[PDB]
């Protein structure tokens, strides 16, 4: 078995190898990459996502989210308070202000220490989940707006034709902006490109050990667990590496820098934080190997997780027993 310790693997495809996206994902999996739940892909040196970022300040962040924490430094939840609209130029100036900017630090490790010590005492503002793309239309390789759709994968593998579309999302971050522990909708893959700015640190649990994280989460967030049988789908709970280590949960960490892709694999729980002002683009995708994960994915039916139009069909075809109850939650 390849990569039996479930380490995060880093790939350096050539420009030739960067032509066929599906084929490269399958290659990475042949090397055991998926066992970690997360992989890094450094694009060939000849590739670029677009020519410059010089003209992005006029993108609107219609609903910036203030991420307010509750709990203790290593075990907390976050709620998202909606703020007034602002442009990316306005958001970048806010990220760079004295109130919100990255503190002085020695290296990524010192910054990580500061994040886990001090995150709860601040409420950074995250411009998350903005439909759109920063890839130039002429970028033909690993253009996250030109990928094969999940609906088309489901049709190729299973013969069934369904409604729905699959488009990318932009994320504008600042120091301490946080993504809570989660797997993707329907335990899909994700791919995330860091277009510009400061790094993003990731934590990940191997898919084969995801239920150990779930059991710890039920213990640490016991009222949330009684409220919903899949409350991690709410995307609000944080658990630090120190707490994970104290509880014997297998995990890994890695820092993504501008110009790099990350892939999350089906049922790979992940969480993380931004080091400073940045912009990422991410989208869900599927392969043939995902289908069985999609059939087994948990679902939030308490009604809190409230997700996309296209998830309806996935549930309806892959999980027809749950259909009914899951749609009572979503309506
Ligand atoms: O970048 C972020 O805030 C969150 N991204 C992801 O969870 C992802 O790409 O799967
Ligand atoms: Mg603009
Ligand atoms: Ni994710
Ligand atoms: Zn729920």
From Swiss-Prot:
Its cofactor is Fe(2+). Zn(2+) binds at residues 228, 234, 300, 302. GO terms for molecular function: chromatin DNA binding; damaged DNA binding; histone demethylase activity; histone H3K9 demethylase activity; histone H3K9me2/H3K9me3 demethylase activity; metal ion binding. GO terms for cellular component: blood microparticle; chromatin; nucleoplasm; nucleus; pericentric heterochromatin; site of double-strand break. Transmembrane segments: none annotated. Residues 8-50 form the JmjN domain. It comes from the Eukaryota. Its EC number is 1.14.11.66. Ubiquitinated via 'Lys-63'-linked ubiquitin chains. Deubiquitinated by USP14 with the help of TRIM14 leading to stabilization. Binds 1 Fe(2+) ion per subunit. Histone demethylase that specifically demethylates 'Lys-9' of histone H3, thereby playing a central role in histone code. Does not demethylate histone H3 'Lys-4', H3 'Lys-27', H3 'Lys-36' nor H4 'Lys-20'. Demethylates both di- and trimethylated H3 'Lys-9' residue, while it has no activity on monomethylated residues. Demethylation of Lys residue generates formaldehyde and succinate. This is Lysine-specific demethylase 4D. The gene is KDM4D.
């Amino acid at each position: 078995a390849q990569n039996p310790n479930c380490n995060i693997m880093i790939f350096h495809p050539t420009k030739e190898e960067f032509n066929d996206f599906d084929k490269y994902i399958a290659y990475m999996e042949s090397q055991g990459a998926h066992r970690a739940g997360l992989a890094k892909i450094i694009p060939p040196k000849e590739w670029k996502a677009r020519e410059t970022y010089d003209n992005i300040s006029e993108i609107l962040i219609a609903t910036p989210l203030q991420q307010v924490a509750s709990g203790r430094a290593g075990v907390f939840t976050q709620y998202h308070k909606k703020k007034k609209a602002m442009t990316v130029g306005e958001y970048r100036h806010l990220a760079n202000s004295k109130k919100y900017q990255t503190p002085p630090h020695q290296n990524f490790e010192d910054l990580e220490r500061k994040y886990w010590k001090n995150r709860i005492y601040n409420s950074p503002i995250y411009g998350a989940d903005i439909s759109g793309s920063l890839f130039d239309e002429n970028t033909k390789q690993w253009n996250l707006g030109h990928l094969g759709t999940i609906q088309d994968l489901l049709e190729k593998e299973c013969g069934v034709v369904i409604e729905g579309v699959n488009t990318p999302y932009l994320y504008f971050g600042m120091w301490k902006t946080t993504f809570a522990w989660h797997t993707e909708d329907m335990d899909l893959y994700s791919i995330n490109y860091l277009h510009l700015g400061e790094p993003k640190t990731w934590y990940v649990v191997p898919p084969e050990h995801g239920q150990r994280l779930e059991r710890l989460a039920r213990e640490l967030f016991p009222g949330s667990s009684r409220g919903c049988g899949a409350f991690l789908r709410h995307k609000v709970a944080l658990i630090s590496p120190t707490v994970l280590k104290e509880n014997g949960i297998p995990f890994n960490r890695i820092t993504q820098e501008a110009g790099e892709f990350m892939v999350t694999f089906p049922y790979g729980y992940h969480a993380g934080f931004n080091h400073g002002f940045n912009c990422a683009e991410a989208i869900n995708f599927a392969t043939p190997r995902w289908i069985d994960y999609g059939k087994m994915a948990s679902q939030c039916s308490c009604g809190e997780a409230r997700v996309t139009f296209s998830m309806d069909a996935f549930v309806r075809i892959l999980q027809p027993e749950r259909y009914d109850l899951w749609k009572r939650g979503q309506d």
